[PDB]
Amino acid sequence: QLTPAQQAALRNQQAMAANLQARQIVLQQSYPVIQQVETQTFDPANRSVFDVTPANVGIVKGFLVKVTAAIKNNHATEAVALTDFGPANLVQRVIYYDPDNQRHTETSGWHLHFVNTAKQGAPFLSSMVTDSPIKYGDVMNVIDAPATIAAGATGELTMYYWVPLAYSETDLTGAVLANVPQSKQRLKLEFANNNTAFAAVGANPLEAIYQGAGAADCEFEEISYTVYQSYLDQLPVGQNGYILPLIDLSTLYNLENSAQAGLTPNVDFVVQYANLYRYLSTIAVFDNGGSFNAGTDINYLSQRTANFSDTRKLDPKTWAAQTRRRIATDFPKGVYYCDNRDKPIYTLQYGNVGFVVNPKTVNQNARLLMGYEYFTSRTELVNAGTIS
Amino acid sequence: AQVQQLTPAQQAALRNQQAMAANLQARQIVLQQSYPVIQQVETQTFDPANRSVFDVTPANVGIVKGFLVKVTAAIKNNHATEAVALTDFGPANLVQRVIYYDPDNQRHTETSGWHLHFVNTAKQGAPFLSSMVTDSPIKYGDVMNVIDAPATIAAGATGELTMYYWVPLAYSETDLTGAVLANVPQSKQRLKLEFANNNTAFAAVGANPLEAIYQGAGAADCEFEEISYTVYQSYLDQLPVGQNGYILPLIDLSTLYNLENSAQAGLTPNVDFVVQYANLYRYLSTIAVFDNGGSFNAGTDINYLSQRTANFSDTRKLDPKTWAAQTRRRIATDFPKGVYYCDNRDKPIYTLQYGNVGFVVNPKTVNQNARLLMGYEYFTSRTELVNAGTISTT
Amino acid sequence: QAALRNQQAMAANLQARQIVLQQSYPVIQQVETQTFDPANRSVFDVTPANVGIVKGFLVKVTAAIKNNHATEAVALTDFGPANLVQRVIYYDPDNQRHTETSGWHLHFVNTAKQGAPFLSSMVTDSPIKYGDVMNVIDAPATIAAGATGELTMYYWVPLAYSETDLTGAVLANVPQSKQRLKLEFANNNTAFAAVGANPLEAIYQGAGAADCEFEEISYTVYQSYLDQLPVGQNGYILPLIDLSTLYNLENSAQAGLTPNVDFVVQYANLYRYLSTIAVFDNGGSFNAGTDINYLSQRTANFSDTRKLDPKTWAAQTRRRIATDFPKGVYYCDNRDKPIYTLQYGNVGFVVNPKTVNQNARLLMGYEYFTSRTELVNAG
Amino acid sequence: NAGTDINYLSQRTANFSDTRKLDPKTWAAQTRRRIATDFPKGVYYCDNR
Amino acid sequence: APATIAAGATGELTMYYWVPLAYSETDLTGAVLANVPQSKQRLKLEFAN
Amino acid sequence: NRSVFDVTPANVGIVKGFLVKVTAAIKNNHATEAVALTDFGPANLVQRV
């Protein structure tokens, strides 16, 4: 007793036990509701940035965003073809904001798709090809895009995005309480337009959808989007009011992305985990000057700690072998996943953690596109004994 | 009482003095034990051809001191040959109306956008959020373009406007009179905002550019592309707790600090036009705008301005150039053409009988459909706003 | 239960400060003057006089810059003549550092305390010839090939906070000790930057900066103090808490900026921070807010208290200094309620950038109060 | 005119703001519930019974 | 509403709906007490296309 | 572009109902043939509330 460091450790142990108890009361007594909040069809030649107001009901868990599009190739003779990211570049940016102006997610289009893949164990909303004579397979075309739009043809695209607030369906960490009176929540959505979704032969196809010799005449016709809100209702009521997990709702499950530049061949390139977050995953995309290679331009990927010690330091084919253990496939050409969900990276446990890439080949205008996925809470920072 | 109806000692016997001494003690405890927070509460971007009136939900926290409203616009001029030019009120006409309702569904401020801008100027002592030009070699100046608007949008061009509004609830950062205690779980608190649209923001040549933003021979083809707005709420968090709940200044929170506007017509040349002040309000300043039938002049159509009282008739009967000299001692410049400012912050008009104090304009030349556009700020002390009347009469 | 005595010690401190400010005499006197050539020497140590209660210093720097290039010219940077002094260090007679900051940071705190650009002339509409007559702070905008320009710059080095608040001042009561006022000046390797180089600490930048050099730099130090101090029944009458408090100006430098990520700069745990100035050096490039998403001040690394975009952040400083700080410079005023934690990093300064170039750093200038562990031994 | 020359009609108070601020066709909708027709052009009815 | 719209013409439509919560103006059965600390009421509207 | 809208009114007092005024403009771009009103008419402007 009597020391504020261990007096705070005792009430953090009691608050964590009462939070896990109140969580499973909620997940037993509530009901999952999913309802549509907005639908709009537009033209990207006029406007391509939209803001959606979700409903302030219940405990919000996340958003399902269907994006449908039509693309005409108006070239005379030349065709185009899909990129490696493809229809995941239909959305360029997803931003969500709390009713307290707390930013939750600021992914790109491709980074939100890869976190949806890595949290399923398979490519997101795909259908496996089986040997069954019963006609399963690709019936409804949930995520669909033509591989080639010829000169004069038209291609229908479909894409789905799960924008997560809560962590999972059994972990309500990051969910937004919305059954109290408060400000409105904000879900900003920037879409692909006629400048960012078609790339010429030789341009950087990172955020493009199609690339080819007829991309100068390609254009959009329509883009429709539908947003569905997934939330919990009929919340349980106790003797003191609502029974709520009080430090799960005040924790943020976030999905930033970033970038860095300045890579030198055969020199270790460190991207530090900057803030005091609890990092859960990490996606590195090696944009080697518009070129994307399957590990032949990287010597090793690694993760360092404070005393310069690698806690994993693998070949690019061995880094991809740990990816196949989780999602049962490979991420696209140039994308490197790092799972840390069992022991999250926290730069207050063993010092400062970094992310290392040692490149073998470096082209001009080469960069490393990062994507983070982490937890954020409020750090309590008591004084231990002496002040001086 | 020789000038005023009630002297400041006569209107101090109409108040409880032990409740006022307990009120200034409670304000000093709040202002030294709280933390000033400013927080963005709403942001959305729209087309005014689709929607132009918006209701903003603030945050129910602390003691709210006011709102900062940032407005950004993207005016396009689709004419073939002709250009338009910025009016005198300019980007201050981006917001047409401002209404605030508190947690108890009581309105506080209901005024226009140009009147809110001039009270923002009159309380700073300078044009609001502007940068002065100096002769420093270090590159100070207008770097960030906080309030910005191009002076001319040509035929086939686009202009970007930026405008800021302080919507006051509390009177100042040291005087919490007018502030709103908002730590109650309700939803009646809102901030209604009507914006400029394609009809009210572009005036033709020879029209009335009072509420317009641009004016010119190519104003029929001018359109908005986009208007964004951002609302920031300034408040005081972590209120001091003693016994009996929070320690709060009870007279400061049961008093409103409002901004209201009204229009009076019926001016004739070379006689007095007495716009009467009203019973039971406590007036702090007065903006008068002489719209001389769509024409605005630099004092060349007024004989004199004055304030008026029942006994002791005139108190500041001055020439228009001398009226402007008393406001260059206030805001270090003068207001645009047609705008005249009267200050009453030292001795506020609180007068217990309706038309006891009046505001006089003696015009030289009156065009057809001429009017005075008044703007008032006042303390009105809830439990007597229910027994009040209309803010002005002519 | 200890505020019954500590508020009485503050009441006796304010009651004794007013006696000093009304019974003493404010004097300003020249202490040192020197004219030198920066090719030989550019660090100078100045010994002020040990007299009275010292309030601050009024260093003025005059330079002449010759452009020996054949065809090309140079031009002023955004910080301009404020980079004539590179470092200002002051030391107490009791070996206590009172201010260690840069020249550009000292100039902006001079701006931030006036409410206007420091010692500038406001342009008005008057027909009476006011304006820039005496050229108190002046510098030519472009020095052509073969021309010479004359610069003048003034620096107020503060010891006390203001002229009515003697918090931070030095009682110069020890004849055997002495004060130190080390001043580092610009030279030919600092004041001239080439095209594309970092213009942060430079004075002139252009295509002819390889042949630009100083001809001379002169400086003059004036000292403001309170003469004729009132004497009581035992020693001087003094505000003891006011003189047992430092008023410091420091500058730092952080790095590790990535786009779309919150970059937090933690405050220390025992200072009372009055103002923060953040300069976004985006790899030798300075932008007018178009590379920052927002700036903020969050408490427990979670909850922001003033999170604003760069145009609303600049709107809060136009209420303070009635103009805008130069490109990349961002001011944060905390003078009404100073930032004061008891635990390290329990308040931070946040910059969320949008575009980050290589060699991007964030320069942080601070201004704060610090108490000493005991009183200052009057006599 | 049949509401063509009016932005809105209203009924204010001092404490409260506008109580029934309506456009001229919605003000007319409140009178078609009263007298089951419209008044002639320019005539506007306000019931406070 | 106009009765017909000819080839090349344009018609203007106007229509009012009353969404009821209380039963009548003298019977408050069905009305919503929105002085509650829960949340904001919603009114979803599908239009023609 | 959009057909469904969600309106979020304030929580004041005892709510009695909502008045919804719908205005429209229908252009007939056919070459020769015209269209005529149905029996439900302008009441099919709001499809679902």
mmCIF file of N, CA and C in Angstrom, chain A residues 237-305:
data_model
loop_
_atom_site.group_PDB
_atom_site.id
_atom_site.type_symbol
_atom_site.label_atom_id
_atom_site.label_comp_id
_atom_site.label_asym_id
_atom_site.label_seq_id
_atom_site.Cartn_x
_atom_site.Cartn_y
_atom_site.Cartn_z
ATOM 1 N N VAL A 237 -29.038 -2.967 -18.783
ATOM 2 C CA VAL A 237 -29.161 -1.907 -17.790
ATOM 3 C C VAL A 237 -29.088 -2.535 -16.408
ATOM 4 N N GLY A 238 -28.158 -2.057 -15.590
ATOM 5 C CA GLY A 238 -28.001 -2.515 -14.232
ATOM 6 C C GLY A 238 -28.651 -1.587 -13.230
ATOM 7 N N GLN A 239 -28.226 -1.717 -11.974
ATOM 8 C CA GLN A 239 -28.802 -0.910 -10.907
ATOM 9 C C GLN A 239 -28.272 0.515 -10.897
ATOM 10 N N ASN A 240 -27.105 0.758 -11.487
ATOM 11 C CA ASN A 240 -26.506 2.084 -11.525
ATOM 12 C C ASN A 240 -26.619 2.737 -12.895
ATOM 13 N N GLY A 241 -27.422 2.170 -13.795
ATOM 14 C CA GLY A 241 -27.505 2.637 -15.160
ATOM 15 C C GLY A 241 -27.063 1.563 -16.135
ATOM 16 N N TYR A 242 -26.526 2.005 -17.267
ATOM 17 C CA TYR A 242 -26.058 1.079 -18.286
ATOM 18 C C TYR A 242 -24.797 0.362 -17.826
ATOM 19 N N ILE A 243 -24.676 -0.903 -18.207
ATOM 20 C CA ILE A 243 -23.500 -1.710 -17.915
ATOM 21 C C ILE A 243 -22.615 -1.665 -19.150
ATOM 22 N N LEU A 244 -21.510 -0.930 -19.069
ATOM 23 C CA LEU A 244 -20.665 -0.686 -20.222
ATOM 24 C C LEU A 244 -19.215 -1.011 -19.899
ATOM 25 N N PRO A 245 -18.476 -1.588 -20.844
ATOM 26 C CA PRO A 245 -17.027 -1.734 -20.656
ATOM 27 C C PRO A 245 -16.321 -0.390 -20.745
ATOM 28 N N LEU A 246 -15.884 0.133 -19.598
ATOM 29 C CA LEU A 246 -15.547 1.547 -19.503
ATOM 30 C C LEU A 246 -14.168 1.890 -20.042
ATOM 31 N N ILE A 247 -13.245 0.934 -20.128
ATOM 32 C CA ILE A 247 -11.940 1.210 -20.716
ATOM 33 C C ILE A 247 -11.758 0.530 -22.058
ATOM 34 N N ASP A 248 -12.779 -0.158 -22.563
ATOM 35 C CA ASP A 248 -12.808 -0.578 -23.957
ATOM 36 C C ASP A 248 -13.371 0.497 -24.866
ATOM 37 N N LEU A 249 -14.372 1.228 -24.388
ATOM 38 C CA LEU A 249 -14.956 2.316 -25.151
ATOM 39 C C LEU A 249 -14.080 3.559 -25.156
ATOM 40 N N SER A 250 -13.234 3.739 -24.144
ATOM 41 C CA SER A 250 -12.309 4.862 -24.092
ATOM 42 C C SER A 250 -10.943 4.532 -24.679
ATOM 43 N N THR A 251 -10.811 3.392 -25.345
ATOM 44 C CA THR A 251 -9.615 3.005 -26.074
ATOM 45 C C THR A 251 -9.904 3.138 -27.563
ATOM 46 N N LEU A 252 -8.888 3.498 -28.338
ATOM 47 C CA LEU A 252 -9.032 3.723 -29.768
ATOM 48 C C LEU A 252 -8.303 2.632 -30.539
ATOM 49 N N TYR A 253 -9.006 1.976 -31.454
ATOM 50 C CA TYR A 253 -8.399 1.020 -32.374
ATOM 51 C C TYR A 253 -8.244 1.716 -33.718
ATOM 52 N N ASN A 254 -7.003 1.965 -34.116
ATOM 53 C CA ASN A 254 -6.706 2.931 -35.157
ATOM 54 C C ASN A 254 -5.894 2.294 -36.272
ATOM 55 N N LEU A 255 -5.988 2.898 -37.455
ATOM 56 C CA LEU A 255 -5.398 2.369 -38.680
ATOM 57 C C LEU A 255 -4.717 3.451 -39.527
ATOM 58 N N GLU A 256 -3.748 4.163 -38.958
ATOM 59 C CA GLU A 256 -2.941 5.114 -39.722
ATOM 60 C C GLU A 256 -2.143 4.432 -40.838
ATOM 61 N N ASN A 257 -1.757 5.224 -41.838
ATOM 62 C CA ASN A 257 -0.705 4.857 -42.780
ATOM 63 C C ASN A 257 0.280 6.014 -42.897
ATOM 64 N N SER A 258 1.440 5.743 -43.488
ATOM 65 C CA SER A 258 2.484 6.755 -43.606
ATOM 66 C C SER A 258 3.419 6.384 -44.750
ATOM 67 N N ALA A 259 4.562 7.067 -44.808
ATOM 68 C CA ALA A 259 5.578 6.849 -45.827
ATOM 69 C C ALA A 259 6.907 7.391 -45.320
ATOM 70 N N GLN A 260 7.991 6.896 -45.914
ATOM 71 C CA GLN A 260 9.335 7.401 -45.667
ATOM 72 C C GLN A 260 10.142 7.260 -46.946
ATOM 73 N N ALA A 261 11.221 8.030 -47.039
ATOM 74 C CA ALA A 261 12.080 7.999 -48.212
ATOM 75 C C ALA A 261 13.537 8.056 -47.778
ATOM 76 N N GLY A 262 14.431 7.932 -48.754
ATOM 77 C CA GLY A 262 15.853 8.008 -48.487
ATOM 78 C C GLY A 262 16.505 6.666 -48.231
ATOM 79 N N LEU A 263 16.338 5.727 -49.157
ATOM 80 C CA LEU A 263 16.853 4.375 -49.004
ATOM 81 C C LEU A 263 18.132 4.222 -49.810
ATOM 82 N N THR A 264 19.146 3.629 -49.188
ATOM 83 C CA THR A 264 20.454 3.416 -49.774
ATOM 84 C C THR A 264 20.700 1.919 -49.920
ATOM 85 N N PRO A 265 21.246 1.461 -51.052
ATOM 86 C CA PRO A 265 21.479 0.021 -51.244
ATOM 87 C C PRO A 265 22.465 -0.560 -50.240
ATOM 88 N N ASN A 266 22.078 -1.711 -49.670
ATOM 89 C CA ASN A 266 22.830 -2.468 -48.660
ATOM 90 C C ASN A 266 23.074 -1.663 -47.387
ATOM 91 N N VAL A 267 22.173 -0.734 -47.075
ATOM 92 C CA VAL A 267 22.225 0.066 -45.855
ATOM 93 C C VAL A 267 20.877 -0.064 -45.162
ATOM 94 N N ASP A 268 20.899 -0.358 -43.864
ATOM 95 C CA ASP A 268 19.677 -0.567 -43.104
ATOM 96 C C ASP A 268 18.879 0.725 -42.982
ATOM 97 N N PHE A 269 17.589 0.643 -43.291
ATOM 98 C CA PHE A 269 16.696 1.794 -43.349
ATOM 99 C C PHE A 269 15.638 1.614 -42.270
ATOM 100 N N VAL A 270 15.730 2.400 -41.205
ATOM 101 C CA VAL A 270 14.912 2.204 -40.015
ATOM 102 C C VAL A 270 13.728 3.158 -40.049
ATOM 103 N N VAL A 271 12.535 2.619 -39.826
ATOM 104 C CA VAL A 271 11.320 3.396 -39.626
ATOM 105 C C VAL A 271 10.882 3.161 -38.189
ATOM 106 N N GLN A 272 11.028 4.175 -37.347
ATOM 107 C CA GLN A 272 10.773 4.023 -35.923
ATOM 108 C C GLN A 272 9.282 4.022 -35.621
ATOM 109 N N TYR A 273 8.888 3.206 -34.648
ATOM 110 C CA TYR A 273 7.547 3.273 -34.074
ATOM 111 C C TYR A 273 7.541 4.454 -33.117
ATOM 112 N N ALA A 274 6.932 5.562 -33.543
ATOM 113 C CA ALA A 274 7.157 6.849 -32.894
ATOM 114 C C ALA A 274 6.413 6.977 -31.571
ATOM 115 N N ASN A 275 5.088 6.896 -31.599
ATOM 116 C CA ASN A 275 4.310 7.268 -30.429
ATOM 117 C C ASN A 275 4.207 6.114 -29.437
ATOM 118 N N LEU A 276 3.531 6.380 -28.324
ATOM 119 C CA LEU A 276 3.328 5.403 -27.256
ATOM 120 C C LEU A 276 2.071 4.578 -27.489
ATOM 121 N N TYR A 277 1.971 4.008 -28.680
ATOM 122 C CA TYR A 277 0.868 3.147 -29.055
ATOM 123 C C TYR A 277 1.224 1.697 -28.763
ATOM 124 N N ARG A 278 0.222 0.832 -28.847
ATOM 125 C CA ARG A 278 0.415 -0.613 -28.783
ATOM 126 C C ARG A 278 0.162 -1.151 -30.186
ATOM 127 N N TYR A 279 1.234 -1.343 -30.943
ATOM 128 C CA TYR A 279 1.136 -1.659 -32.362
ATOM 129 C C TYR A 279 0.794 -3.127 -32.566
ATOM 130 N N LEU A 280 -0.207 -3.389 -33.401
ATOM 131 C CA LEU A 280 -0.697 -4.742 -33.624
ATOM 132 C C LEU A 280 -0.256 -5.337 -34.947
ATOM 133 N N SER A 281 -0.116 -4.530 -35.991
ATOM 134 C CA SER A 281 0.357 -5.034 -37.269
ATOM 135 C C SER A 281 1.082 -3.918 -38.000
ATOM 136 N N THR A 282 1.739 -4.289 -39.094
ATOM 137 C CA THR A 282 2.595 -3.373 -39.835
ATOM 138 C C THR A 282 2.673 -3.862 -41.270
ATOM 139 N N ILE A 283 2.321 -3.003 -42.218
ATOM 140 C CA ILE A 283 2.395 -3.321 -43.638
ATOM 141 C C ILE A 283 3.437 -2.410 -44.265
ATOM 142 N N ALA A 284 4.436 -3.006 -44.902
ATOM 143 C CA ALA A 284 5.454 -2.271 -45.632
ATOM 144 C C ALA A 284 5.285 -2.538 -47.118
ATOM 145 N N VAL A 285 5.194 -1.473 -47.902
ATOM 146 C CA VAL A 285 5.111 -1.574 -49.350
ATOM 147 C C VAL A 285 6.346 -0.904 -49.922
ATOM 148 N N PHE A 286 7.168 -1.678 -50.618
ATOM 149 C CA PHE A 286 8.422 -1.177 -51.169
ATOM 150 C C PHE A 286 8.158 -0.678 -52.581
ATOM 151 N N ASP A 287 7.788 0.596 -52.682
ATOM 152 C CA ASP A 287 7.617 1.275 -53.964
ATOM 153 C C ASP A 287 9.009 1.621 -54.469
ATOM 154 N N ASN A 288 9.570 0.737 -55.289
ATOM 155 C CA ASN A 288 10.943 0.891 -55.768
ATOM 156 C C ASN A 288 10.983 1.746 -57.036
ATOM 157 N N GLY A 289 10.516 2.980 -56.898
ATOM 158 C CA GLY A 289 10.470 3.899 -58.020
ATOM 159 C C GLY A 289 9.465 3.527 -59.087
ATOM 160 N N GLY A 290 8.264 3.120 -58.687
ATOM 161 C CA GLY A 290 7.263 2.651 -59.611
ATOM 162 C C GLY A 290 7.338 1.175 -59.934
ATOM 163 N N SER A 291 8.447 0.522 -59.612
ATOM 164 C CA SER A 291 8.611 -0.906 -59.824
ATOM 165 C C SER A 291 8.259 -1.655 -58.549
ATOM 166 N N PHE A 292 7.628 -2.813 -58.710
ATOM 167 C CA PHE A 292 7.248 -3.669 -57.595
ATOM 168 C C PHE A 292 7.789 -5.058 -57.874
ATOM 169 N N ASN A 293 8.633 -5.556 -56.981
ATOM 170 C CA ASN A 293 9.288 -6.838 -57.168
ATOM 171 C C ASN A 293 8.940 -7.769 -56.016
ATOM 172 N N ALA A 294 9.061 -9.067 -56.280
ATOM 173 C CA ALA A 294 8.714 -10.093 -55.297
ATOM 174 C C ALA A 294 9.961 -10.498 -54.509
ATOM 175 N N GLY A 295 10.413 -9.570 -53.670
ATOM 176 C CA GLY A 295 11.476 -9.833 -52.725
ATOM 177 C C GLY A 295 12.878 -9.864 -53.289
ATOM 178 N N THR A 296 13.049 -9.696 -54.597
ATOM 179 C CA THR A 296 14.373 -9.762 -55.200
ATOM 180 C C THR A 296 15.162 -8.469 -55.058
ATOM 181 N N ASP A 297 14.562 -7.413 -54.516
ATOM 182 C CA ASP A 297 15.247 -6.150 -54.292
ATOM 183 C C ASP A 297 15.417 -5.835 -52.813
ATOM 184 N N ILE A 298 15.203 -6.811 -51.937
ATOM 185 C CA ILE A 298 15.349 -6.644 -50.497
ATOM 186 C C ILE A 298 16.307 -7.717 -50.000
ATOM 187 N N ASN A 299 17.288 -7.317 -49.189
ATOM 188 C CA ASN A 299 18.157 -8.295 -48.549
ATOM 189 C C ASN A 299 17.464 -8.962 -47.367
ATOM 190 N N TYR A 300 16.947 -8.170 -46.432
ATOM 191 C CA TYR A 300 16.201 -8.705 -45.303
ATOM 192 C C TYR A 300 15.302 -7.619 -44.734
ATOM 193 N N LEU A 301 14.166 -8.043 -44.198
ATOM 194 C CA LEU A 301 13.302 -7.199 -43.389
ATOM 195 C C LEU A 301 13.469 -7.607 -41.935
ATOM 196 N N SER A 302 13.329 -6.645 -41.030
ATOM 197 C CA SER A 302 13.645 -6.915 -39.638
ATOM 198 C C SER A 302 12.862 -5.987 -38.721
ATOM 199 N N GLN A 303 12.972 -6.253 -37.422
ATOM 200 C CA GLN A 303 12.412 -5.399 -36.382
ATOM 201 C C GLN A 303 13.415 -5.318 -35.243
ATOM 202 N N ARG A 304 13.864 -4.111 -34.920
ATOM 203 C CA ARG A 304 14.877 -3.904 -33.897
ATOM 204 C C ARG A 304 14.264 -3.377 -32.612
ATOM 205 N N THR A 305 15.020 -3.501 -31.532
ATOM 206 C CA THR A 305 14.624 -2.999 -30.225
ATOM 207 C C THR A 305 15.653 -1.935 -29.819
#
